[PDB]
Ligand binder design. Structure first.
Ligand SMILES: Nc1ncnc2c1ncn2[C@@H]1O[C@H](COP(=O)(O)OP(=O)(O)O)[C@@H](O)[C@H]1O
Ligand SMILES: [Mg+2]
Lengths: 474, 56, 469, 127, 468, 127, 239
């Protein structure tokens, strides 16, 4: 029969008699209305994981099969909404009428269904788009200590996607409802909610919903990829997602492994992150890029979960607690951060100046330590030091203020050719704001040429137009 | 005296460079022993949880 | 309906219900038995339901001692969780985990009783109007401002000053903010509950405060549910009276250790370093209910014991996630005579942004952390080489860092009896003005001794003269 | 008995570590489920139900007193162990003894920069 | 014959048999079910028998996802282990763990299938004629020779050039040796497998190669059995065709980790650092079949991921018990601009003894390791003090070392899309003659820059005249 | 057989470290509770029951002999590990070989600072 | 063996010596048995009854008003870890404890007894002479000061240590090897005759080194000599 009865209830885990025809991974409904996953099928009982408040469930309660594998609603109707891990609305803006539902468990694209990534994903951050390029089907990790800017980089990226045809999905796993509310309001203030979907499983939600959240957010991201469009998925913290799975596994009495996590942890994150990819032209050419985030205790990158995800992903963005408290934003460690899949997808115009930036910062980052004193080093090293300091000022950028690629090219071109070598370090920020407004207000020809050609042909106009700004208004 | 100051500052610099290098190899070797002692102890505690739970 | 005791093993008791229906999870049960003959003992016990087992049977955690229990004793279902008195009648009273009064003053006679297990506020009911709660304490108000509706954590070892700093904060809110406060003594030492009760009964602060204690000698089930009792009493003032209230929790480390002991008693597999597998879920059930809503706000000050100086232990580590601000107290400052002993270089808050606090506040607090760090980078050279080798700029930077380091010190009212110093409250405008005047180098020809234990900067300037200099 | 009659008493427990081991033995042989360092979850309640009985009574109760001096032994200096951290959190102060100071000729061998008492000042005389 | 699913727990599935007899251990089972109503899902699955339980019941490990399975579903016993096609019709083809073709080229239509679990060769069938396999790669062929029928370990971080070197070896065997290669991928990024497939498809190597994949996203049952599929396909070329063939394994560390996950799921008690208790047995079942016999030979190159950058870990320690040689790709060499990145001082092999290789080969390899160590022991004086302060003997040793360090470099054929260089092949006699000629002081006039990326020694002499 | 008949014999065990791993596998599959480094409690009796059968018999028994040369493998030179120190506690002497000295051109690479024999001096000829 | 030694104390009133080469084996035999009996394991897999079983053996080995039992016992330390339940449980029962160090054995100093971890109940000013107490105090202190300096001597050159620390190193070097002695039962291993030293010559010997009378004597002369007069002729045998 379709119905069974509860025989035992613990912390969010239950066992039931009956349910003869239920299938592995099926959604099951409780008489109260709460829902659960049928995980284990035994000779005489079914092990159910509860997807809501378990305190209303008792021994002897009726439980019924839904006749469906665990699925989440998908479609265009979800854009501009806040939902829970089961797709249910949590914004109060009424019901959602999605007509399509896809499982949260799908096999990733095969070896021949894919192609290498050739088109970029613009983040709007001058340190990332120039030194750590990102493709439209890449998996990049954001990693660092708590309270260092990890979500701010992800929100700045989503706000930069206003002009591009990218649908952004943000998944909150174990986050405080207050911070979630602050994120939803920041996205509405900047208009990002016209092309964004927010999925939430907050710190008070059961560990089962915090486990399902990234898979549901990935299933919403796949619908756009299956129709040939581009999608971006953000996972606010994989560190809390691992803790949530550790809880369910220990409560199912599974033996632990390294650092008390189960052996199955690596498969939990490889199965998730391998689904983000750029499809081949025969499959439709669609794409899905992922930006997972991880927290390290005291800067320890060697821990189990951090190294486990470093082995799955295509590159990392390293954030420092010391730089964040030293007045620097976004506080990215450019001497350690790198992308493997990037560079091939980057535009020609950024490549013509990024090479100079990387060589100059390498020289500065090495000698900066030895040249800590004011002027003991020779002119041959002093020139490197001042250039490094000035380029470091050009790398600084305020919160929720993405800079477009054409403007990034002209400011980075200004620093890497030595036109800022006589400007005092304290005036570089004022020079950047003034120079970009000067070029946009009366020289839009330079910006429109970069936007359509994606390469620098003739730079001669920019050299002459820039000298005119320097002589008239410092 | 000028040559003595140059040789003193160079001697203190080269000696403290070797001392700093010695301190770092000692810190590296000690850290590997600290990591091995701590890592060896953690896998035993995990083994006691397995044996203890299987004993009920 | 009525059930019967089936097993007894330390703080754990199993009960069978048979006919009618079984109680819900977290539901409270009562045992009231009178000795039938001289070989028995009278018993008055409360139990909390933890899990269903089958055979019409339930496992429970005892709220008091299980000594004298007998198999077959009758048990009664109250139909709800532990319920505690709420309202203005709860002000100036001491309470047990079950909400019964400890003090001999009589019955509380309140009009309503609220359950200890209720759902937190929804994402819709969340408010985002961030602002600053003035404490009058010169180190917190500058380096780690407290957000209204936010959580502040005090981290440190034994004897650093956590409970005295909590007692001074309770006083200051009752002095100028005129608000209602709740103190939850989670696993409190009975020697300290006596000192908190006496300071508040003589200073008059008790009439505006609620005290919830239980005892460190009670079973783990009581040490675990007590922080929720203080919180359920603080919720009524926000939700039904629309006020802004401050909740003080002394040592959530005891709360974490008590959930571990309950999980081990129930038979759950140990997690990292032997803690319960549910640690992050249990911490959050308490931290989430503390938030600013459209009705009012609950802000919270919490003390955390750092075992063996290790901040990576699961208890401190799970707590950091729910903290808007952080204070680390250093034993090296406490023994050097600097109180409250907060480390200027490890204390931080989320609200330390120009969009939430003044440009002058942000700029001064930045210049303070910078000059202190610069002085820390030079104390090796000042000890091995003569101070006569330091440059003119570094020499002045050292002297200013030296004045600023002690200017962070402040005499507390609750601590006047120990040293005999009257006690001071400093407003935000004078904290910012004070550090700005030292940083700007206006006040240089004043001796370092004048900045130790003084309140405002005018008091330091007159003190220089009082010391004939 | 002495405290209840208005007199003063002092109680020394030569080693609480062997007392915890004795309880571990009985609890494991009775099949109660183990926890941290193989001990029963009940072990904090064991020492806290004991050490909280040491107190100074009010004048209405007679003004009597009972002070306690429990002792604990650490394996190779591990103060972070289960029973040591458990009893360190219950007491009003701790005296730390170092094997290093003892062989170096500092004979009572007390770590004065680590040892602490909360009652310090209030316990001492004005001189 | 006809079982029925009795339990389901992730990859683990329990089946009860009746009216006949039970299947053997390692045996494959098949579930083929069509949705009876709109509430059910179609399922196509394969299971492998792990152990007998009593009460006519058997425990099995699923090869694919178990979602949608129902207690009471019919199960078909295939009567034998996982069987995969064998023959020359497997070359230039991509396969799954069950031997089904991945590529859309059609059915393989091979004449025979071969069981994947088969006994290794006995002591009476072995071959003690240790000889060498010319790779044409100048660092491998001198400092760490590869024996026919042996096991070689490849070490290096993500991005140091492992995929580049693997393809260079597969290509080189297909170029002059005209032999067959097999590549197996376990716990690997599906992205990397695609980058290797296109790079092979353009270099023409695919027609002489077999590809088998078990991805990083596949369930533990598939990641555990995939290396055996490549090996069962390589054995037919040895046994029924008498050839010498090369087996590549993407990461035997994911082979080791996949066995650890299957063990944890089966509920066996773990050993030191949480690896499976059977790690040594499981490593042997794969490693002993990889041997040379009186019919023909199989050799294998295996890449190892060193967890936490520490070799004391059990998987590396249990792998080294089976290995004959080690090749280390170094990050410090990679940043220096050296593309093959093989460390001359950390690479070694069992074959590198005077009683296996010729006296002249041992003498040159000894003189090379010694001059490179001597040069590494002197770069501090040369970097901290002026180069004019070194003595005549150390100066001439440095000049020879400066030429030799870059004369070890070789441009790869698979690197034309990166750097455009034609690619070079160096034979054993010119490697020995080249290093001997520099060591004996006969060729010291030629400039240093001429020895970087040139192939044989004569090519450096013409490059010095042609660069101007 | 040779010793029981008055003849002399010698036996080599190529690696006792692998013999121990095989017994750990059989014992864990029989579900016996593990101890140090997951090896069974019975692991000392395993090697001591084998190595004490090597002896020189008395003249009344025939004067025969059986010498033994077991071999063990150390991870990273950790001579202090469980199975290595366990067999060292049963044998009449140890010959320790250094992986560090071996790459410095030294053979047999025996570390004389750690290597020693309990039967030594007495078995050696007078010269 | 203990039941046979008890008869001579209880029924015959005699003074006896009881030697036990290994009490650790007695503990492991109880551990091997415990799992099969059906007991729950404790720390490092040991039996829950470990301290009770060691006390059943050790409380019987005592001197009474009838006679006396003196005992020498050897305790094996697995994997060189003294924190192991078996060695740890045993320390509570002993009146004197001698710990042997591999670092001393690997350096050729025998019997290899660790001077900083070895102790006895009898080492009190009320039970031994003022001269004995003062010499033992000065020996333990100089060796601890030398142990606290091997890091500083590794990071900085020995020419950077003060004159006092320089002398303390030379005296600690002479003392650690003057503690070495050739045994009669070890003539096969040591290649030397074997020596017996009376307490008077031990105290006189260490006092003479501590007081600096022998600063102009090589460290190598103090190795493998029974008494101080021998060290001085061993210096003469080398120009
Ligand atoms: N402001 C202060 N001024 C002087 N002494 C103080 C002050 N604050 C703390 N102390 C001293 O240190 C002790 C702090 O104890 P407590 O509040 O229990 O510290 P903690 O909980 O951090 O361990 C006090 O009992 C008192 O002796
Ligand atoms: Mg405290």
């Amino acid at each position: 029969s379709d119905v069974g009865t509860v025989i035992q209830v613990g912390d969010g885990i239950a066992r039931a008699h009956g349910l003869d025809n239920v299938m592995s991974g099926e959604l099951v409904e409780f008489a109260n209305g709460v829902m659960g996953m049928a995980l284990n099928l035994e000779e005489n009982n079914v092990g159910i994981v509860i997807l809501g408040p378990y305190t209303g469930i008792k021994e002897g309660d009726e439980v019924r099969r839904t006749g469906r594998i665990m699925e989440v609603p998908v479609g265009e109707e979800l854009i501009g909404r806040v939902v829970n891990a089961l797709g249910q609305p949590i914004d109060g803006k009424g019901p959602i009428n999605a007509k399509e539902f896809r499982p949260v468990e799908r096999k990733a694209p095969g070896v021949v269904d894919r192609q290498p990534v050739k088109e970029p994903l613009q983040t709007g951050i001058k340190a990332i788009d120039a030194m750590i390029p990102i493709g439209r089907g890449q998996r990049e990790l954001i990693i660092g200590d708590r309270q260092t800017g990890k979500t701010a980089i992800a929100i700045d990226t989503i706000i930069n996607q206003k002009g591009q045809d990218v649908i952004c999905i943000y998944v909150a796993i174990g986050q405080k409802q207050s911070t979630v509310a602050q994120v939803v309001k920041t996205l509405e203030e900047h208009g990002a909610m016209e092309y964004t979907i927010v999925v939430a499983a907050t710190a008070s939600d059961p560990a089962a919903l915090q486990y399902i959240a990234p898979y549901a957010g990935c299933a919403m991201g796949e619908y756009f990829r299956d129709k040939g469009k581009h999608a971006l998925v953000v996972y606010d913290d994989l560190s809390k997602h691992a803790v949530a799975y550790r809880q369910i596994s220990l409560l199912l009495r599974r033996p632990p492994g390294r650092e008390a996590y189960p052996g199955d942890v690596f498969y939990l994150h490889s199965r998730l992150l391998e689904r983000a990819a750029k499809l081949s032209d025969e499959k439709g050419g669609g794409s899905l890029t992922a930006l997972p985030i991880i927290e390290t205790q005291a800067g320890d990158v060697s821990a189990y979960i951090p190294t486990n995800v470093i082995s799955i992903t295509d590159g990392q963005i390293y954030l420092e607690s010391d730089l964040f408290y030293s007045g620097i934003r976004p506080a990215i460690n450019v001497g350690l951060s790198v992308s493997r899949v990037g560079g091939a997808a980057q535009i020609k115009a950024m490549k013509q100046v990024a090479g100079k930036l990387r060589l100059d910062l390498a020289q500065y980052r090495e000698l900066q330590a030895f040249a800590q004193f004011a002027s003991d080093l020779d002119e041959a090293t002093r020139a490197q030091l001042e250039r490094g300091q000035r380029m470091t000022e050009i790398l600084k950028q305020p919160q929720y203020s993405p800079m477009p690629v054409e403007k990034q090219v002209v400011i980075i071109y200004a620093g890497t050719n030595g036109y800022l070598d006589d400007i005092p370090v304290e005036k570089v920020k004022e020079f950047e704001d003034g120079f970009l407004e000067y070029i946009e207000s009366k020289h839009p020809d330079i910006l429109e040429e970069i936007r359509e050609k994606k390469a620098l042909d003739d730079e001669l106009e920019e050299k002459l137009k820039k000298a005119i700004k320097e002589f008239k208004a410092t | 005296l000028l040559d003595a100051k140059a040789s003193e500052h160079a001697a203190r610099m080269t000696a403290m460079k070797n001392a700093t290098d010695n301190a770092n190899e000692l810190i590296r070797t000690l850290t590997l022993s600290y990591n091995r002692a701590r890592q060896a102890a953690i896998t035993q505690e995990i083994t006691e949880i397995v044996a203890g739970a299987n004993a009920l | 309906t009525r059930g019967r005791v089936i097993q007894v093993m330390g703080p754990v008791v199993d009960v069978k219900f048979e006919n009618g229906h079984l109680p819900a999870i977290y539901n409270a049960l009562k045992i009231q038995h009178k000795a039938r003959n001289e070989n028995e003992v009278d018993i008055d016990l409360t139990l909390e339901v933890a899990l269903h087992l089958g055979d019409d049977t339930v496992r429970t955690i005892a709220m008091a001692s299980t000594d004298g229990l007998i198999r077959g004793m009758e048990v009664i279902d109250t139909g709800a969780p532990i319920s505690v008195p709420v309202g203005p009648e709860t002000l100036g009273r001491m309470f047990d985990v079950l909400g019964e009064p400890i003090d001999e003053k009589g019955p509380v006679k309140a009009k309503k009783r609220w359950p200890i297990h209720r759902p937190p506020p929804s994402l819709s009911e969340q408010s985002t109007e961030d602002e600053i709660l003035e404490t009058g304490i010169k180190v917190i108000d500058l380096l780690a401002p407290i957000p209204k509706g936010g959580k502040i954590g005090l981290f440190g070892g034994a004897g650093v000053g956590k409970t005295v700093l909590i007692m001074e904060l309770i006083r200051n809110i009752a002095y100028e903010h005129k608000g209602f406060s709740v103190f939850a003594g989670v696993g409190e030492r009975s020697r300290e509950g006596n000192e908190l009760w006496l300071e508040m009964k003589e200073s008059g602060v008790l009439d505006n405060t609620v005290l919830v204690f239980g005892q460190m000698n009670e079973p783990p089930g009581a040490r675990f549910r007590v922080a929720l009792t203080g919180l359920t009493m603080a919720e009524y003032f926000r939700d039904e009276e629309g006020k802004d209230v401050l909740l003080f929790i002394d040592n959530i480390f005891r709360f974490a250790q008590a959930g571990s002991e309950v999980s081990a008693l129930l038979g759950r597999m140990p997690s990292e370093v032997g803690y319960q597998p549910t640690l992050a879920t249990e911490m959050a059930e308490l931290q989430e209910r503390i938030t600013s809503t459209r009705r009012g706000s609950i802000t919270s000050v919490q003390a955390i014991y750092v075992p063996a100086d290790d901040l990576t232990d699961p208890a401190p580590a799970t707590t950091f996630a729910h903290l808007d601000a952080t204070i680390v107290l250093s034993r090296e400052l406490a023994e050097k005579g600097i109180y409250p002993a907060v480390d200027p270089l490890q204390s931080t808050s989320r609200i330390m942004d120009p969009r939430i606090v003044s440009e002058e506040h942000y700029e001064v607090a930045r210049r303070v952390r910078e000059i202190l760090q610069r002085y820390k980078d030079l104390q090796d050279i000042i000890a091995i080489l003569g101070m006569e080798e330091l440059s003119e700029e570094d020499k002045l930077i050292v002297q200013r860092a030296r004045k600023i380091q002690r200017f962070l010190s402040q005499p507390f009212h609750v601590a006047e009896h120990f040293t005999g110093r009257p006690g001071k409250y400093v407003p935000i405008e004078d904290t910012i003005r004070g550090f700005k005047e030292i940083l700007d180098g206006k006040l240089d020809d004043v001796p370092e001794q004048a900045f130790y234990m003084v309140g405002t900067i005018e008091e330091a300037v007159e003190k220089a003269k009082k010391m004939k200099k």
